[PDB]
Amino acid sequence: SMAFLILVIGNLHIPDRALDIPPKFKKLLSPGKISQTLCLGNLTDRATYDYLRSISPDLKIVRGRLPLMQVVTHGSLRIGFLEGFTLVSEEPDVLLAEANKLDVDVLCWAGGSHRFECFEYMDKFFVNPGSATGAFTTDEEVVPSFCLMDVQGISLTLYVYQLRKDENGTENVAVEKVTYTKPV
């Protein structure tokens, strides 16, 4: 409640490339903690849809071809979400131009890489959450990840959750923290 937490998932590809959001992710997500969920990419699987709705009072699906983008504002930050499959981090000027069309400080896109990535460029913040199911690419395995955006005033703290295999074979959830602060 006192925190404003956005759950960001993308490129689920259920049931065409994956069967389910990994249980070790579901065990971390509980009702009453997430304020809003953005799902990048289509979502046609009834069980996944029902589960996501149980986790937040506000589920927004941003699809392939039913919204084409979504902007959310909290505090002084303006966060844009889109699918943007042709967008790649190796072309930050193309991503920046997209952020400038939406007039957002943070641009989140579910790029065809299916890999978590984030970077800063010209006082803006760019986030690809990867695939929450680890769904393979058409374009080194893909690894499941999702993000939480914790928005406080002019700051966004990004928490990246990733399911990674230890040397002994076990998949465990790792988490990394990145902070963006909008410059004055």
Binding site: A3, L5, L28, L148, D150, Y159, Y161, V173, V175
Partner: peptide
């Protein structure tokens, strides 16, 4: 010291 929002880990 602190945790991520979901309580998975204190950070180191």
């Amino acid at each position: 010291x602190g945790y991520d929002p979901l309580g998975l880990k204190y950070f180191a």
